[PDB]
Amino acid sequence: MKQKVVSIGDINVANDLPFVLFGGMNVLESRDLAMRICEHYVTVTQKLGIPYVFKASFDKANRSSIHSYRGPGLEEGMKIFQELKQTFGVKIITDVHEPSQAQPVADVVDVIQLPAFLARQTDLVEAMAKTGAVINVKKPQFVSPGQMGNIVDKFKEGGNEKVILCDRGANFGYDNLVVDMLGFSIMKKVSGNSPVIFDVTHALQRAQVAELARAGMAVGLAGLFIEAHPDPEHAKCDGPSALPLAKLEPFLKQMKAIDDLVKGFEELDTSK
Amino acid sequence: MKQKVVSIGDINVANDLPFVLFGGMNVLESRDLAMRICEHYVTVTQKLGIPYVFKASFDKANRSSIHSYRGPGLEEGMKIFQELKQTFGVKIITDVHEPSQAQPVADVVDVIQLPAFLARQTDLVEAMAKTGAVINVKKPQFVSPGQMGNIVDKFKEGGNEKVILCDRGANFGYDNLVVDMLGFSIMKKVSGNSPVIFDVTHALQRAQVAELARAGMAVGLAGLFIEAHPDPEHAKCDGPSALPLAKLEPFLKQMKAIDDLVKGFEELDTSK
Amino acid sequence: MKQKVVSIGDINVANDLPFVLFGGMNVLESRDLAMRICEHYVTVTQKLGIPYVFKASFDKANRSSIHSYRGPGLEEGMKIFQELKQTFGVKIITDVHEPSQAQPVADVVDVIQLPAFLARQTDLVEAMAKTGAVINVKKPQFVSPGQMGNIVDKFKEGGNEKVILCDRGANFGYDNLVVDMLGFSIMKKVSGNSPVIFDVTHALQRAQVAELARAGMAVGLAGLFIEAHPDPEHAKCDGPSALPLAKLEPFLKQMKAIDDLVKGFEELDTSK
Amino acid sequence: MKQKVVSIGDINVANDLPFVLFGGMNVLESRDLAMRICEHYVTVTQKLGIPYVFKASFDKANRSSIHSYRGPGLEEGMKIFQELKQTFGVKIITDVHEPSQAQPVADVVDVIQLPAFLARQTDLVEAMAKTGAVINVKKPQFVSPGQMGNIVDKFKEGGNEKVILCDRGANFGYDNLVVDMLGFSIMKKVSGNSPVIFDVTHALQRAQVAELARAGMAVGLAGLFIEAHPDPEHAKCDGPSALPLAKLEPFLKQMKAIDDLVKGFEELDTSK
C-alpha cells in the first residue's frame, strides 16, 4: 500500500515521505513584511532541511464589516508573489474565491487553494479543476473525514488529479474546535491515499500550537500548514492564531525530530 | 420590547405576529411540477389562513459530481417564477450564489436568500445589500446563534435593513444535526429582534418533521420554512428531506393551532 | 400502537394521557420550606387540573468539597415525606444512591429514582428492581436515546416492569447541554413505549425554562419534571436551575394549553 | 515550574519523567490467563526499559443484563493479585465501586482507581481518601478538562494527595468519542501539575490504537494506560478494545522512542 504522490515542482508531497511545510503569513499586508516573513522561513527551512512552500492570502472574504481591509487584490497580489519567487526561489500557495481567479493565479503560483466555506462549490471547483494546477482542499469543520472522497472525485472529473487535503479541526459544540487525530487515516483511505496535511494554526481559531502540532506529526503526515507573525500580540485580531517568528526554528526542530522518527517506523498492525 | 417587522409586500414578518410559511420545493425540476406543488400550498394556506411565500431553487451548487443537474439556470429560472406570480399571485423566495445574480433576481422575486456556506461572503452580501430587497440569512450549522449579529450588521451597512434569520440546526458530532430550541431567543436578541424562522426540513438532513416543527412553533417564531414533494420515496436523494404534499394540510393545522395558541400568551418571566 | 401505562397509585403515567407533573424542590433543606413549596404546587395543580407527584432529594452525592451539606439523611429524610403525605395527600418521588437504601424508601415513597451517573449501576438497579416500586431512570447526558432499551431490559429481568424514562439533555461540546427534541420518539420506541418525561430544569444546568418546556410539551410527553424555589436569586448555587414559585401557575397554564391541544391531535404520518 | 511527583513504591510518576505504563487486561477472567498476560508485559517492559503497573478488574458494574459475568469478586480477586505480586514482583492497579471495598484493596494493591461514572461520588471518594493510597481518577467523558480541580481538591481534603488523572476522550455527538489533545495541558495546570495519563483503549470504545497513542505521547505525558488480549477477535465484546498481545513490544517501542525524544526537548514557548 503505497501513498499517492503529488509533486509541486521539485517537491514531492506524500504521506510516507518527509513532511513538507506550507508555512507563511495570513494576509499580504505589505511586501516589506511579506519579504521579512518569507525571509525567515526559507533561512530556517534551508538550514534545517525541510521542503517549504510559502503561503499568503491576497484576499479576504471572511473579514467583518465592509469598511475593512479586503486585501491587496488579485491584480496587485500576484505581483507580490513574482518578486518573492525571484528573490527567494520558493513556491507560493494562495487560496482564490471566485471561479475566474483560478487561471490567473495558476500561472503566478505553484499550489492554489480551495477554502473550506467553498469546498462544496461545484462551479469554483470545476474551474479550479481546469487549471490543472495542484490543489489543497481545506476540510470544512462541519464535514466528517470520510466524506472527503466526493471532493477528490469531483476534481478527478474536472481532469485534476493533483490534490492535497488539509485538516483544520471539527466543530465541538458552540464556538470551538477539536482535532480528531483519527480522521487523518480516514482521510488517507477514502482519498486514494492522497497527501494529508494539518493546519495547526486554524485548528486553534496560543502556547498550545506546539503540543498540538507535535501530536499531529506523531500520527504521520504529508505536511504541516502554519502561519506566523513578527508581533502576534499587538497585531492580534481574529480568524487564526499565528506563531511567533522568532520561535519558528526551535519549533520546527520539534516537528522534524518527530516526523523523521515516525516516518521511519516498521509498519505496525494493531489490527490483529 | 416590540419585534422588528420586515414586510414582503402585503406580508408582515415578525416574531410576535402570526407565523408566515415559506413553503415550496427544493429545486425547479419542471414547471409542470412547480405549478402542481405551488398549487397545493396556496389552496391550503388560503383555506387555513396562513401567509405564504412559495420557495424554490433555480440553481444548485451543493450537488455531487459535475455531470449532474445544475438546475434550470438563472435566465430560465426567473421565467418560471413569472408565470407563477401571475397564475397564483403569491410571493417567490429563491437563494442566489454569485454577486451578479443578486439584482436580476431582486426584480423577479420578493425575498432573496443567502445560503449558509456563503453566509460569510462579504462580496456576495454587499452585492445582495445593494438590491435593497428582503433577505433571508440561513444560519450556518457551524456558527453559534449569538454570532448572527455580524451578518445583520454587515447588511445594515450595505444599506439593507430588511432581514430574516433562518435556523437549520447545529453540528452535533460527525454527520448529524440537532436543533437547539434555545438559540431562537439568542438570535432574536442579538438581531435587534429581527424575524427568526425555522427550516425544519433542512434540520433533518422523516416521520420526524412533525414532532420537530411542533417544538419549533411552541417556542414562538416568525415563520416556518419547509419543502415537500408529491412522491418523496422514489424521488428521494439527499440534501434535505421533503414533506409529503398530501399531508401538507393536516400538518399545517398542527402549526396554526400551536402558533396561534402561543402567539397569544400573557408574556411570561421565569427570569425572576 | 398504544402506550404503556405505569401507574403511581391513582395516577396513570403514559405518553398519550394528559401529562403528569413531577414538580418539587432540589434538596430537603428544611420542612418549613418543603411544606411551603409543596403547598404551592398542590394548590396550583389541584386548581389547574394536573396530576402531581412532589419531588425532593434527601441526599446529595454531587456536591463539592466534603465539608458541605450532604442532606437530611435517609433516616431523617423519610420522616419528612411522611408528614407531607398526611398533611397534603400527594405522592413523593425521591432518588437513592446505594443498593441498600432502595427498600427503605420504597415503603415511604411512591416513585423512587435512579440517578444518571448510576444509570449503569447493575447492583443498585437489581436492588431497585427488587422493591417492585415504580422507577424513573434519568437519561445520562452521555448516552444516546436509542440505548435506553438496555436499562429498561435490565429492570424487566430484576422483575420490575414499571419504569419511566427521564430526559435531561445531551452533551454539546465542553460544559453545555442541548435537548434533542427527536430523542423522545427514539426513547418511546426502544422502550416498549414506556412513559417519557422531560427534566427541563436539569437540561438547563433562566428566563429560558419556559420556551424550552413549551417545546418539550409540543412534542407530546407523558410528563414534566421541574424544580422551583421561593427565592432563586440569593439561594442560587449550581447543579440545576430552579423556577420562581410565584410563577408556577402562569407557567403551568402554558404547559396544559400545549399538552391538551397536542394530546388531542389526529395521529399524523409525515412518514409517507 | 516543576511537576508534582506521585510515587507508587520505587516508581515515580510525573509529567516530565519518563512515561510509566499501566498496562494489563480488562477483567480477571482466570489466573491461567491473567498470569499469561502479566507475563508478557513484564518481560517486554523489563526488556525495553519502561516502568510498569499491571492492571485488571476484579469486578464489573458496567456489564449488560444481571445474568452475566460480574467478575471474580473482591474476596476472590484480591487473592489473584497476591500470587502475581510474588511470582512477578510488579505493582497492581484495580478500580473499586463501593465505599467499603476501598480499604481491603488498598492493602492488597499499590494504585487503586476511581471509575468515571463515580468520579463525582463524594462518599466513595472520601472513603478512598482515607486509605491514603495512590489514586487514579478516570476523567468522565462528560466533563471538561478544566474541572478536574474539584476532584483533586475533594481528595486533598480527604487527606489524600497522591493522585493521577486519567483521560479517556470526550463525547462527540451520539455514541462516539474524540480525544482533545489540548485537554492534557489544561488538566496539568488545574491539578497542581499532578500526573496525567492517557487511556488509549478506552478512548476507542482497532488498527487505530497506535496512531492515537503516538499522538498522545508526543504531547508529553506521565503515563499510558492500555489493555490487551491474546485473541481480541473471538473474545471481542464491548466496552473497551484491547491490543493484540503479540504486538505489545513493537507498539511500545513506538511509545518510548516518542516519550524519550519528547521528554527531552528544550522547553518551548510559542506563547510569545
Side-chain angles (χ1 to χ4, degrees), chain C:
Chain C
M1 196 49 154
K2 58 165 289 174
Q3 305 302 323
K4 164 110 184 303
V5 173
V6 178
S7 64
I8 302 152
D10 66 293
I11 315 181
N12 293 336
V13 191
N15 296 155
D16 54 9
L17 302 180
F19 92 92
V20 176
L21 163 49
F22 304 61
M25 43 175 29
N26 184 301
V27 200
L28 274 168
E29 288 162 58
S30 54
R31 48 88 57 168
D32 301 309
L33 178 60
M35 290 264 275
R36 183 192 173 187
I37 302 292
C38 181
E39 207 292 306
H40 195 193
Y41 272 112
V42 185
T43 295
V44 184
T45 61
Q46 233 118 271
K47 162 177 179 177
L48 276 180
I50 297 129
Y52 169 52
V53 185
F54 180 73
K55 114 76 184 170
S57 298
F58 63 74
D59 192 318
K60 286 264 62 63
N62 320 287
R63 321 290 71 64
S64 67
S65 139
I66 295 80
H67 292 71
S68 296
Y69 184 45
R70 282 277 84 69
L74 40 278
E75 180 271 303
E76 180 60 60
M78 297 297 93
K79 297 174 63 176
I80 318 162
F81 294 123
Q82 308 278 38
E83 179 181 318
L84 296 158
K85 290 189 136 304
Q86 56 179 70
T87 309
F88 293 114
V90 293
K91 292 75 157 59
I92 272 62
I93 174 176
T94 200
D95 47 294
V96 347
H97 301 77
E98 305 293 9
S100 62
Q101 290 179 288
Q103 203 53 58
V105 193
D107 303 44
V108 193
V109 304
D110 300 275
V111 181
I112 56 175
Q113 193 188 75
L114 180 58
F117 297 67
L118 312 173
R120 270 252 78 170
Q121 285 314 294
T122 308
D123 289 324
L124 173 56
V125 162
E126 275 236 282
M128 279 179 64
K130 251 251 102 181
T131 64
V134 173
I135 312 276
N136 184 214
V137 166
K138 296 291 287 292
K139 170 192 167 305
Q141 59 192 84
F142 58 86
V143 171
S144 61
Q147 301 294 295
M148 301 295 287
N150 305 297
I151 285 69
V152 186
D153 297 332
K154 287 165 68 180
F155 266 104
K156 174 184 191 175
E157 288 165 45
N160 207 302
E161 268 173 54
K162 40 179 68 186
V163 183
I164 287 64
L165 297 177
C166 197
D167 188 70
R168 42 75 101 269
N171 237 279
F172 186 65
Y174 284 135
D175 305 309
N176 197 184
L177 291 169
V178 72
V179 180
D180 186 16
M181 293 292 100
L182 292 178
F184 292 124
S185 282
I186 287 296
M187 290 181 105
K188 291 189 209 167
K189 165 225 175 185
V190 326
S191 63
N193 282 284
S194 286
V196 185
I197 59 179
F198 183 31
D199 187 343
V200 63
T201 55
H202 287 290
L204 280 171
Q205 294 154 305
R206 283 89 175 190
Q208 281 175 147
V209 172
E211 49 199 42
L212 213 226
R214 289 193 218 114
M217 294 305 297
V219 163
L221 309 169
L224 181 52
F225 187 113
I226 197 166
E227 314 198 328
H229 205 281
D231 189 54
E233 295 164 347
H234 291 295
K236 99 183 68 178
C237 306
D238 270 334
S241 48
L243 180 70
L245 265 179
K247 283 282 166 53
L248 220 195
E249 187 169 317
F251 162 74
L252 281 187
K253 274 199 239 290
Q254 297 248 47
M255 308 306 111
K256 186 172 174 208
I258 295 303
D259 165 60
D260 281 341
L261 208 215
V262 147
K263 254 46 161 43
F265 274 127
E266 282 278 337
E267 208 181 81
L268 187 52
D269 183 300
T270 44
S271 165
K272 39 186 149 294

